[PDB]
């Protein structure tokens, strides 16, 4: 089952304030009107930056797993959002065939942990996410909103893990998964410095002209 990624998925690329200006930038963005896969979890590739989104009312989705082999041979990222204390770890975890957590199973044999991080809690409400791995910096952009329409994405954390991440899996009824691509946009900055509109410069010749 596929759905259209209407125009969602635009984020501030550089943590730099600008106002009342049109800025053209190149980064891994989700191209406009691309196909987004809809799932109802199996292991999925992570190739170069993955756009996530879910709508629930009871925080049913509770965590992620990131890694390369998921067989304790390498350090693997583990995110387990608790009720009030979200936990991020990087350990040589052994992952279950179908890890799930209200009883948990994925966090057994926690040995040779190389990174631990604790933060503020996350999660009729659509909760999106963006994950990118750049030069050992793992970057998460997020925003929860009350998929048609436009909304910009602010960053949350930047974890200097430096681990080679290739696949992922989600911990648990339905969710969306897109893939980023190295496409250039034109970003419109409001007087308050918030991105209001954008133009996919390779979408169509009119947008090519607008960017030019």
């Amino acid at each position: 089952a596929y759905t259209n990624s209407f125009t969602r998925g635009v984020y501030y690329p550089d943590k730099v304030f600008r106002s009342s200006v049109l800025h053209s930038t190149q980064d891994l963005f989700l191209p406009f009107f691309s196909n987004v896969t809809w799932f109802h979890n199996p292991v999925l590739p992570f190739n170069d930056g993955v756009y996530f989104a879910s709508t629930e009312k009871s925080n049913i989705i509770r965590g992620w797993i990131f890694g390369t082999t998921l067989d304790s041979k390498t350090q693997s990222l583990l995110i387990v959002n608790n009720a009030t204390n979200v936990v991020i770890k990087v350990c040589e975890f052994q992952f279950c065939n179908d890890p799930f957590l209200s009883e948990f199973r994925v966090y057994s044999s926690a040995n040779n942990c190389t990174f631990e991080y604790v933060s503020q809690p996350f999660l009729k409400n659509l909760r999106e996410f963006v994950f990118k791995n750049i030069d050992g910096y793992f970057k998460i952009y997020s925003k929860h909103t009350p998929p048609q329409g436009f909304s910009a994405l602010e960053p949350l954390v930047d974890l200097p893990i430096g681990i080679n991440i290739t696949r992922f899996q989600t911990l648990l009824a339905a969710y969306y998964v897109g893939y980023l691509q190295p496409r250039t946009f034109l970003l419109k900055y409001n007087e308050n410095g918030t991105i209001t509109d954008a133009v996919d410069c390779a979408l169509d010749p009119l947008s090519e002209t607008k960017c030019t």
Partner: protein, 250 residues
């Protein structure tokens, strides 16, 4: 004009430029400290036959306190002076903690021989970090053995007294740097042409209060044509405007 006679007119000869009066350096505020609070800071040391190796990462390491501390009997560093570590950065640091005798303190060195260096903790011939040693007679003077295994005759009554030894081994290429010294901050001065350094962003100009509502995540603002027009202050989160300090032709 390269002449001794100047005809009537207006000529441009030089340029006026105000110079900065002082430099202001500011950086992200002090955060979690490296848990140096736990090894010599500790209650009991493991024996040298089963010395401990603790990893320390993702923290700021102030070597000034330990270097100024006079409680260390020996402090031998290789490579860089102990006062420059506040500038240097590393990927990881490991602490090798054990108890030995003073006569055995000579064994902690590259390319050394002896019972310890041959049957026990042996240092590599390559780059070493820093070794710290002190006499621990008061606290540790048959519970301690050395690797076939023999016990020390630690009698509470100079080379046979217990010495506790910690070796600081530095990993400097394994990953992006996460353990570094601090960054001493300075007071900020406004309405003067100053030479500033905000969280790694450099330049000169005059700093004034600004009414630009930045977003909580951006750190510095930049006007059209890629010029820094404002930055936000660390340690006050205030948003301060930058204006080039006056110049022009003469």
């Amino acid at each position: 004009l390269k002449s001794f006679t100047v005809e009537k007119g207006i000529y441009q000869t030089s340029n006026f430029r105000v110079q900065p009066t002082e430099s202001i350096v500011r950086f992200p505020n002090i955060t979690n400290l490296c848990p140096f609070g736990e090894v010599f800071n500790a209650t009991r040391f493991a024996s040298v036959y089963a010395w401990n190796r603790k990893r320390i990462s993702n923290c700021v390491a102030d070597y000034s306190v330990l270097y100024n501390s006079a409680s260390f009997s020996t402090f031998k560093c290789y490579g860089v002076s102990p006062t420059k570590l506040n500038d240097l950065c590393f990927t990881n640091v490991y602490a090798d903690s054990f108890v030995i005798r003073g006569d055995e303190v000579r064994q902690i060195a590259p390319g050394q021989t002896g019972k310890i260096a041959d049957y026990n903790y042996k240092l590599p011939d390559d780059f070493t970090g820093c070794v710290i040693a002190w006499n621990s007679n008061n606290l540790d003077s048959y519970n301690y053995l050395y690797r076939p295994l023999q016990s020390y005759g630690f009698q509470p009554t100079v080379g046979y007294q217990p010495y506790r030894v910690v070796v600081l081994s530095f990993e400097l290429l394994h990953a992006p740097a996460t353990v570094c010294g601090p960054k001493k901050s300075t007071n900020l001065v406004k309405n003067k042409c100053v030479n500033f350094n905000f969280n790694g962003l450099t330049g000169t100009g005059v700093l004034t209060e600004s009414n630009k509502k930045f977003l909580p995540f951006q750190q510095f603002g930049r006007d059209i044509a890629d010029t820094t027009d404002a930055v936000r202050d660390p340690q006050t989160l205030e948003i301060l405007d930058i204006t080039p300090c006056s110049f022009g032709g003469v």
